[PDB]
Amino acid sequence: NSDFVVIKALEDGVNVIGLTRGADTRFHHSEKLDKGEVLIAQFTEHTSAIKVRGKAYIQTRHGVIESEG
Amino acid sequence: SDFVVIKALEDGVNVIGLTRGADTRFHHSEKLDKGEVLIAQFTEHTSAIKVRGKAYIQTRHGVIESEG
Amino acid sequence: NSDFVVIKALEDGVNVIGLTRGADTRFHHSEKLDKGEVLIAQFTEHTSAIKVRGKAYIQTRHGVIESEG
Amino acid sequence: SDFVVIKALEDGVNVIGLTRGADTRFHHSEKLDKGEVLIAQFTEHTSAIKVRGKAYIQTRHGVIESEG
Amino acid sequence: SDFVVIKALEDGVNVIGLTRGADTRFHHSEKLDKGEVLIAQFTEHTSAIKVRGKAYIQTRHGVIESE
Amino acid sequence: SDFVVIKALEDGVNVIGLTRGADTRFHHSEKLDKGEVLIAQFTEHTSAIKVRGKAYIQTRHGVIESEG
Amino acid sequence: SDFVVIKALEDGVNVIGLTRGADTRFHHSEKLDKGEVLIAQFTEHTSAIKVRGKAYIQTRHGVIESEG
Amino acid sequence: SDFVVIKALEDGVNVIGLTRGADTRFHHSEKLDKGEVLIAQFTEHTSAIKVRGKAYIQTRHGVIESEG
Amino acid sequence: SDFVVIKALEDGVNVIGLTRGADTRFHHSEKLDKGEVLIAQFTEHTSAIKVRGKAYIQTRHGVIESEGK
Amino acid sequence: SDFVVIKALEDGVNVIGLTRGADTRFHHSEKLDKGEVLIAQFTEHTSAIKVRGKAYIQTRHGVIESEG
Amino acid sequence: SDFVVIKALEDGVNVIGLTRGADTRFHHSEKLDKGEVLIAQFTEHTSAIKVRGKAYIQTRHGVIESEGK
Ligand SMILES: N[C@@H](Cc1c[nH]c2ccccc12)C(=O)O
Ligand SMILES: N[C@@H](Cc1c[nH]c2ccccc12)C(=O)O
Ligand SMILES: N[C@@H](Cc1c[nH]c2ccccc12)C(=O)O
Ligand SMILES: N[C@@H](Cc1c[nH]c2ccccc12)C(=O)O
Ligand SMILES: N[C@@H](Cc1c[nH]c2ccccc12)C(=O)O
Ligand SMILES: N[C@@H](Cc1c[nH]c2ccccc12)C(=O)O
Ligand SMILES: N[C@@H](Cc1c[nH]c2ccccc12)C(=O)O
Ligand SMILES: N[C@@H](Cc1c[nH]c2ccccc12)C(=O)O
Ligand SMILES: N[C@@H](Cc1c[nH]c2ccccc12)C(=O)O
Ligand SMILES: N[C@@H](Cc1c[nH]c2ccccc12)C(=O)O
Ligand SMILES: N[C@@H](Cc1c[nH]c2ccccc12)C(=O)O
C-alpha cells in the first residue's frame, strides 16, 4: 500500500535509481529507460528514496515535476 | 493496494512486472494488442511496472502516455 | 475491501480475464460477456491483474477507459 | 466492503454472484422483476457480480446501465 | 459498516435481507407502510438487501427509486 | 459508528431499534413528542432503525422525511 | 467517536443520554440554561442522545433545532 | 481524537469536563478570563464538555457561541 | 495526533500544557516572545493547551486569536 | 505522521525540538542559514517544535511566518 | 509514510537526512546536480530532511524553494 512515482523518459538512457532503506544509504539498482517508456515504481521495504537522472516527466501525489539531463 | 490501467494503442505493447525484494529484474511480461486493456495491481511480487510501446495509462496521479 | 472494475460489454464475446496473484502469472479464468451485460469484478487473493479483450466500457477509480476489439 | 445498487428496468433481470477463490463459478442468481432494487455487497463468498437484463446500476465509480 | 435508507411511498413495501455466507436466502422481510422510513445496515447476517414496492432509496451512491 | 438524527414534527413519533443478529425484532421504541430530537447510533444491539410518524431525518446520505 | 454540540436557546434544556446495551433507559439528564453549550460524545455508556427544550444543535450531518 | 477551541469573550468563563463512564459529574472547571484560549481534547477522563459564560467556540462542526 | 500552531504577537506569551488523566493541572508553561512560533501536539502527557497573551493560532478548525490581559 | 517545513529567511534561524514525555526541555537545535529548508516530523522524541528567527513555515494548517 | 520531492536548480545541492531517535545527527548527504530529482521518504532512520543549495521542493503542504549559498 505504499506511494508510487510515475517516470516517463523524454530521451534515451534515463536512470531511475533506487536507494537502500535502512541505516545505510547506497544505490541498489538503476533501471535504465529509453525515450517514451514509462516506469511506475513504488517505495518498498528495500527502496526508501528514488533518484532520477536524465530528461523525464514525473508524477507523484504532490504533482508533476520534470528532471533535466 | 494501487493499480495502473494500461490501454494498448498499437500491437505488442509490453507491460513488464519488476520483482519486489532486494533484487530487481523482470518476472513477467504481459503483451497487449491494440485496444486491449490491462488493469494491474502492485503486489507481494511486483513493486514496479514498466510499459513499452504506445499506450494510454491511468494511475491515481492522472493520465500519462507511453511512446513505443 | 479491495478495489473493483466495472466492465460493460459493447459487443458479443467480450472476455474479462483474471491473472493469478503470486510468483506464477497465468490466466486462471476468462469470463465471457455478451452485448450489454455488466461484470463488476474485484481484485482478490487469486486475481492481481485483469485483462479485457473486445469492445467494452470500463470504469475504475481512475475514471472511464474503453477497450476496442 | 463495497456494494452495488441494481435496479431492474424489465422483468427477469439476473444478478449473479461469482465464487471467491481459485475457482470461479456462479453460486447464486437473484432474479429481479421490473422496478425491484437489490443492494448487494462483495463478501467472503462473492468476489465478482454479473448483471444480465436491462438494469440501472450504481457503484462507487458512478452509473452504468446493462441492457438485455 | 454501510447502510441504506428506505422510505415507503405506498403501503406494503418489503425490505428483505439476504443471508451472508455460502448460501443465499431471505431471512427477514420488514413491511413498511406509506411514509415509514427504515435505515438498515449491512451486517454479519445480511450481505444483500432487496426492496419490493414503491420507495425512495438513499445510499452512499445517491438516490434510486424502486416501483 | 454511524448515527441518524430524528426531529419529531408531530407528537408520538416512534423511533424503533431492530435487533442485530440472526433474529430480527423490535427491542425498543423511543417515543418523541413534537420538537424533540433524538440522535441515535448503530450499535452492537441495533443494526436497523425504523421511524414511524411525521419526522425530519438526517443521515450521512442527506435529509429524508417520514410521514404519519 | 462522533460528538454533538447543543446550545440551549432557553432555560432548562435537557440533554439526555440513553444507555448503550441490550437495555435502553435514561442514565443521565444534563440541564442547560439559556446560552450554555454542551459538547457531548457517544461513548461506552451512551449510544443515543435526546434533546428536550429549545436548542440549536450541530452534528456531522449539519444543523437541526429542537423546540420546546 | 477530537478537540474543541474555546476563546473567552468576557472574564470568568468556565470550561467544565464531565467524567467519561457510568457516572456523569463535573471533575474539572477551567476558568478563562477575557481573551484567553483553551484548546481541549476529548479524553479517557472527559467525554462531554460544557461551556458557561460568553465564549467563541470552534469544533469540527463549525463555529458556535455560548452566552452568559 | 493533532497539533496547534501558536505565533506570539507580543513578548511573554505562555502556551500552557494541562495534564492528561483524572488530574488536571499545568505541567509546563512554554514562554514565547514576539514573533516566535510554537507548533505543539496533543500527547500522552498533554490533553488540553491554554494560551495566555496576544497570539495568532491555527488549528484544524481554522484561525483564532488569543488576547492578553 | 505530521511534519513542518521551515525555510530560513535570514542566517541563524533556530529550529528547536522539545522532548516528548512528562518533561519538557529542548533536546536538539538545528540552525539554518538563509535560504535553507528543513522538513521535520513530529516523532517519538519530539512532540513540540519552536522556531526562532525569520522563517517561512508550512504545516497542514497553512502558512505561518516567524519573525526574529 | 510521507515523502518530499527535490529538484536541483544548480550543481551540488545537498539533500541531508537527520537521524530519528534521541540522538540527532546527519547520517547521509545526497548530492544532486542541476536538473536531477530525488524523491525521498521519512523512514525508520530519517525523521527530518535538510536541503542546502538552490532547489525546487514539493511536499504535501505544497511548493517551497531553497535558495543557495
Ligand atoms: N526490487 C525493487 C524494485 C523497485 C521498486 N521501486 C524502485 C525504484 C527504483 C529502483 C528499483 C525499484 C524493490 O522492491 O525495492
Ligand atoms: N502474478 C503477478 C501478476 C501481476 C500483477 N501486476 C503485474 C504487473 C506486471 C506483470 C505482472 C503482474 C503478481 O501477483 O505480481
Ligand atoms: N474466483 C475469482 C473470481 C474473480 C474476481 N475478480 C475476477 C476478475 C477476473 C476473473 C475472475 C475474477 C477470484 O476470487 O479471484
Ligand atoms: N450469501 C451471499 C449473498 C450475496 C452478497 N452479494 C451478492 C451478490 C450477488 C449474489 C449473491 C450475493 C454472500 O454473502 O456472498
Ligand atoms: N440500548 C440501545 C440504544 C439505541 C441506540 N440506537 C437506537 C435506535 C433505536 C432504539 C434504541 C437505540 C443500543 O445501544 O442499541
Ligand atoms: N437482525 C438483522 C437486522 C437487519 C439489519 N439490516 C437488515 C436488512 C434487511 C432485513 C433485516 C436487517 C441483522 O442484523 O442483519
Ligand atoms: N486531565 C483532563 C484535561 C482536559 C481535557 N479536556 C478537558 C475539557 C474540560 C476540562 C478538562 C479537560 C483530561 O484529560 O480529561
Ligand atoms: N458519563 C457519560 C457522559 C456523557 C457523554 N455524552 C453524554 C450525552 C448525554 C448524557 C451524558 C453523556 C458518558 O461517558 O457516556
Ligand atoms: N513534553 C511535552 C511537550 C509538549 C507537547 N505539547 C505541549 C503543549 C503545551 C506544553 C508542552 C507540550 C509533552 O510531550 O506533552
Ligand atoms: N537509507 C535512508 C535513505 C533515505 C530516505 N530518505 C532520506 C532523506 C535524506 C537522506 C537519506 C534518505 C533511509 O532509509 O532513511
Ligand atoms: N532525532 C530527532 C530529529 C528531529 C525530528 N524532528 C525534529 C524537530 C526538531 C529537532 C529535531 C528533530 C527525532 O527523531 O526526534
Residue numbers in the entry:
A (entry chain C), C (entry chain A): 6 to 74
B (entry chain B), D (entry chain K), F (entry chain I), G (entry chain H), H (entry chain G), J (entry chain E): 7 to 74
E (entry chain J): 7 to 73
I (entry chain F), K (entry chain D): 7 to 75
Sentences from the paper on this structure:
Specific damage manifestations were determined within the large trp RNA-binding attenuation protein (TRAP) bound to a single-stranded RNA that forms a belt around the protein. For crystalline complexes such as C.Esp1396I, whether the protein is intrinsically more susceptible to X-ray-induced damage or whether the protein scavenges electrons to protect the DNA remains unclear in the absence of a non-nucleic acid-bound protein control obtained under exactly the same crystallization and data-collection conditions. To monitor the effects of nucleic acid binding on protein damage susceptibility, a crystal containing two protein molecules per asymmetric unit, only one of which was bound to RNA, is reported here.
Here, a methodology has been developed whereby per-atom density changes could be quantified with increasing dose over a wide (1.3–25.0 MGy) range and at higher resolution (1.98 Å) than the previous systematic specific damage study on a protein–DNA complex. To quantify the exact effects of nucleic acid binding to a protein on SRD susceptibility, a high-throughput and automated pipeline was created to systematically calculate the electron-density change for every refined atom within the TRAP–RNA structure as a function of dose. This provides an atom-specific quantification of density–dose dynamics, which was previously lacking within the field. The availability of two TRAP molecules in the asymmetric unit, of which only one contained bound RNA, allowed a controlled investigation into the exact role of RNA binding in protein specific damage susceptibility. By employing the high 11-fold structural symmetry within each TRAP macromolecule, this approach permitted a thorough statistical quantification of the RD effects of RNA binding to TRAP.
